[PDB]
């Protein structure tokens, strides 16, 4: 490795992406970790860990599963708008065919939402209600089927992903690499997409080498996490298909339905 015009350009690209990341996403990983580790004075989230604590936190706030998925997708509109705004800052993205821009984003947003969801998770549970609540992992897992199976694969991804100890500067480039995936179905001009991702991948590799001296093959390990993200998305699409094809009267507490709407 040498400090040459090429490496300096890749550092400028990483800094540009980081600055747009900060402007586009008001809730960063650093802010989420500060809440989870009990270092935010102004924020002491209420902990929901069983049915008793669920009903005690009531004031702090068609199949049931479909309404949850409709509700959380509606609450995820802001995230989609922010991810879309971030993509405009990726050099070359707006010059692509508009159909390809929509295709890259319509598949990419789900993977990025799960990436950001992992920042809200530790081994014990996940932040909800704009950092004002904390829903434990085992309470979610204990809920009746199919609801008890919704979040557990995402916690399993989150613990492996968070063990990489990426920061917001790492995540900014990683998210850009997700968006510029030239293997999405329906893409018209794959080559200009791959040319941009090649630059983002070079910027990502250099960023990880400089920022994580104690990691081995972190570049490869991070890319393998895209395989986990796509598996999570595919499982949801499959579960919705079988839910659309199975008629099951599913009862769930309205407070739990509201909480699931803050998840994904």
């Amino acid at each position: 490795g040498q400090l040459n015009p090429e490496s300096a350009d890749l550092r400028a690209l990483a800094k540009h992406l980081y600055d747009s990341y900060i402007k586009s996403f008001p809730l960063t990983k650093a802010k989420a970790r500060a809440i989870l580790t009990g270092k935010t004075t102004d924020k002491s989230p209420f902990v929901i860990y069983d049915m008793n604590s669920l009903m005690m936190g009531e004031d702090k706030i068609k199949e049931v599963a479909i309404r949850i998925f409709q509700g959380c997708q509606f609450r995820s509109v802001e995230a989609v708008q922010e991810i879309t705004e971030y993509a405009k800052s990726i050099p070359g993205f707006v010059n692509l065919d508009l159909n390809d821009q929509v295709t890259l984003l319509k598949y990419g947003v789900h993977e990025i939402i799960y990436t950001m969801l992992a920042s809200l998770m530790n081994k014990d549970g996940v932040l909800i209600s704009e950092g004002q609540g904390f829903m434990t992992r085992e309470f979610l897992k204990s809920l009746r089927k199919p609801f008890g199976d919704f979040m557990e694969p995402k916690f399993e991804f989150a613990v492996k992903f968070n063990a990489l100890e990426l920061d917001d500067s790492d995540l900014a480039i990683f998210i850009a690499v997700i968006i510029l995936s030239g293997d999405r179905p329906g893409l018209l001009n794959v080559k200009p997409i791959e040319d941009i991702q090649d630059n983002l991948l070079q910027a990502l590799e250099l960023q990880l080498k400089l920022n994580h001296p104690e990691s081995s093959q972190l570049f490869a390990k991070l890319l393998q996490k895209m395989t986990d993200l796509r598996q999570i998305v595919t499982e949801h699409v499959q579960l919705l298909q079988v839910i659309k094809k199975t008629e099951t009267d599913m009862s769930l507490h309205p407070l739990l339905q509201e909480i699931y709407k803050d998840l994904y």
Partner: peptide, 13 residues
């Protein structure tokens, strides 16, 4: 989801 594509299209404007 067409609603999602529409959200993305309006945001891209």
């Amino acid at each position: 989801n067409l609603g999602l594509e529409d959200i993305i299209r309006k945001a891209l404007m």
